[PDB]
Amino acid sequence: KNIESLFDYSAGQFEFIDHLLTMGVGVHFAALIFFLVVSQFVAPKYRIATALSCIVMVSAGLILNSQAVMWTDAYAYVDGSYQLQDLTFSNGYRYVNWMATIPCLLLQLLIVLNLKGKELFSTATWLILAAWGMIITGYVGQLYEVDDIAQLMIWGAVSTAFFVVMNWIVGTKIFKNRATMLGGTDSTITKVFWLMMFAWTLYPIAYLVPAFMNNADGVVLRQLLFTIADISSKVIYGLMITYIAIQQSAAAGYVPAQQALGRI
Ligand SMILES: *C/C=C(C)/C=C/C=C(C)/C=C/C1=C(C)CCCC1(C)C
Ligand SMILES: CCCCCCCC/C=C\CCCCCCCC(=O)O
Ligand SMILES: CCCCCCCC/C=C\CCCCCCCC(=O)O
Ligand SMILES: [Cl-]
Ligand SMILES: [Cl-]
Known part of the structure; x- marks a missing residue:
């Protein structure tokens, strides 16, 4: 059902994808240790934001590792190229994982924006529903990426509408709550918005x-x-x-954070 299953791969292509995925595992698990160690320098009201980064590193790292092993399970070197064997490789597992990781990425943004209480809970609910609508319609669309390109495009247009509305919610909250942020981070958070959009x-x-x-x-x-x-x-x-x-x-x-920053 996916285009990966259509082709034989040169050794260079095959090895490069394997190395990409494996490098992705290493980077996420390296970053996991960093977020773990620095969480003790984060005040209680924000510490969940750093915990969420840990969760995202392991979640993304596990899906990339699972993709790397599936890639090597699916293909073998036959008659001069890597050819598909009895197992298949697909990107669909990424989409399922996004159902958990996108809410985590959004929730840590809302925490550092200093949303609390009802506004936090209600903003998180709408964001998560919009994200799940985006992900689910995209997942259906890519089931047709070989069989029915028209259908890929239409589900992709529906998915893109949820994406746009989600980004509107995020940007509205950022520019609205910029003013509450401490330590000059009202300037930093706008860069985070642009990094997300890109x-x-x-x-x-x-x-x-x-x-x-x-x-x-x-x-x-x-x-x-x-x-x-x-x-x-x-x-x-x-x-x-x-x-x-x-x-x-x-x-x-928070004295540990003052001392951590002073140490650098
Ligand atoms: C770490 C994973 C992240 C940040 C996943 C982000 C996924 C998206 C923003 C997916 C967007 C899509 C569209 C906007 C339309 C085409 C189908 C998707 C789901 C690929
Ligand atoms: C900011 C995130 C950066 C992600 C790093 C990805 C590493 C990519 C490195 C450079 C790409 C050039 C490699 C050449 C590809 C050869 C293709 C082939 O083998 O046929
Ligand atoms: C086994 C896979 C091979 C690749 C291993 C990668 C080794 C880790 C290298 C750096 C990862 C980038 C994340 C940096 C952690 C944050 C620390 C910091 O920059 O302040
Ligand atoms: Cl606190
Ligand atoms: Cl992910």
């Missing part, structure tokens, strides 16, 4: 590769785009969130 827009570009580059090099490109996007949207983003959490912690008087 990095999350790479996923719909990967989703469209079947329409514009249906060949083995398009398969490689899609995994390359996922890799750039994953590291940007989860690791670099989490580092910025953690920086904002620690900076606001210090400005609110």
Whole structure:
């Protein structure tokens, strides 16, 4: 059902995708240790934001590791190329994982924006429903990326409408609550918004590769785009969130955060 199953791969293509996925595992688990160790410098009111980064690192790291092993299970070197065997490889497992990781990425943003109480709960609910609508309609669309490109496009348009509305909610909350943020992080948080807009827009570009580059090099490109996007949207983003959490912690008087920042 997916374009990966259509092609034999050169050794260079096959090895490069394997190395991409494996490097992605290493980066996420390396970053996990960082977020774990610095969580003791985050004030209680923000510490869940850094815990969420830990959860996202393991969740994303496990899906990338599962994809890497599925890639090597599915293909074997036969008659000079990597050819599909009895098991298949597909990107559908990424979509299922996004059902958990996208809410985690959004929730840590809302925590450092200082939303609390009812506004936090209600903003998180609408965001998570919009994200789940995006993910589910995209998952259906990519079931047709070989059989029915028209259908891929239409479900992709519906998914993109949820994406746009979600981003509208996020941006409205950022620009509305910028003013509450401590330690100069009202300037930082706007950069986080732009980082999200850039990095999350790479996923719909990967989703469209079947329409514009249906060949083995398009398969490689899609995994390359996922890799750039994953590291940007989860690791670099989490580092910025953690920086904002620690900076606001210090400005609110949390002594471990003041001492951590002073040490650098
Ligand atoms: C770490 C994973 C992240 C940040 C996943 C982000 C996924 C998206 C923003 C998916 C977006 C889509 C569209 C906007 C339309 C095409 C179908 C999707 C689901 C790929
Ligand atoms: C900011 C996140 C960066 C993600 C790092 C991804 C690493 C990509 C490295 C450079 C790509 C150049 C490699 C050449 C690909 C050869 C294709 C082939 O083997 O046929
Ligand atoms: C086994 C896979 C091979 C690749 C292993 C990767 C080794 C880790 C390298 C750096 C990962 C980038 C994340 C950096 C952690 C945050 C620390 C910081 O920059 O302040
Ligand atoms: Cl606190
Ligand atoms: Cl993920």
